[PDB]
């Protein structure tokens, strides 16, 4: 069914476009990831009339996303020291959402679908790398330090 999409996707479209994609990828992947949007103003001619505002809406959500990037790039010392044996046993057991217990609410939201971190989420006792993608062009680099309490 017809869906207009917001961000950049490897297939289908670039920014605004109308793609006929199956509902499985739309209601379960494209919609929760903010990579697409349902029928704009509920029809096609309605979409055409409202596209003259959707462009600026895309501009301003990108603008606030850039503001969100600045907010992480400002205060960023969000730290965490683990309680382990330390010398022979070193591994971060915080998963991801313990770190999201220090981003969303306390500081810049940094939603779970926004941070494109790997599946190991850091397993070291030293400064590491956090990658977050507000958009398809912005790359976020965070350096958290670790250790023993």
């Amino acid at each position: 069914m017809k869906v207009i999409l917001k961000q950049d996707v490897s297939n289908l479209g670039k920014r605004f476009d109308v793609v006929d994609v199956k509902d499985g990828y739309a209601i379960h992947f494209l919609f929760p990831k903010k990579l697409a949007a349902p029928l704009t103003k509920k029809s096609l001619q309605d979409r055409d009339l409202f596209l003259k505002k959707q462009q600026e809406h895309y501009e301003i959500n990108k603008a606030l996303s850039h503001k969100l990037k600045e907010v992480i790039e400002q205060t960023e010392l969000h730290f965490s020291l683990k309680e382990h044996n330390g010398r022979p046993y070193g591994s971060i057991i915080t998963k991801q959402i313990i770190n999201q217990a220090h981003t969303k609410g306390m500081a810049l939201q940094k939603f779970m679908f926004k941070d494109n971190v790997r599946l190991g989420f850091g397993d070291h006792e030293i400064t590491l790398h956090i990658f977050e993608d507000t958009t398809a062009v912005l790359k976020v680099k965070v350096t958290p330090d670790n250790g023993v309490k």
Binding site: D23, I27, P38, L39
Partner: protein, 64 residues
């Protein structure tokens, strides 16, 4: 019960006709499947609805 939670549409009782027209009572059950419906960005309850109601929600932009 094996029924929808949005609507109240339930099973349909009927006959199981075969060759020689032998009568045996049977029950048609609704295609109950689990779905999660957001409501004002919160309370994403995992309700058990039929596929027909699921299609209605999908065409209504998940409105219920």
């Amino acid at each position: 019960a094996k029924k929808d939670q949005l609507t109240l549409r339930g099973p349909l009782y009927g006959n199981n006709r075969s060759h020689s027209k032998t009568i045996t009572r049977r029950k048609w059950n609704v295609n109950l499947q689990p779905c999660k419906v957001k409501t004002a960005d919160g309370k994403t309850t995992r309700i058990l609805v039929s596929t027909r109601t699921l299609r209605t929600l999908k065409k209504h932009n998940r409105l219920s």
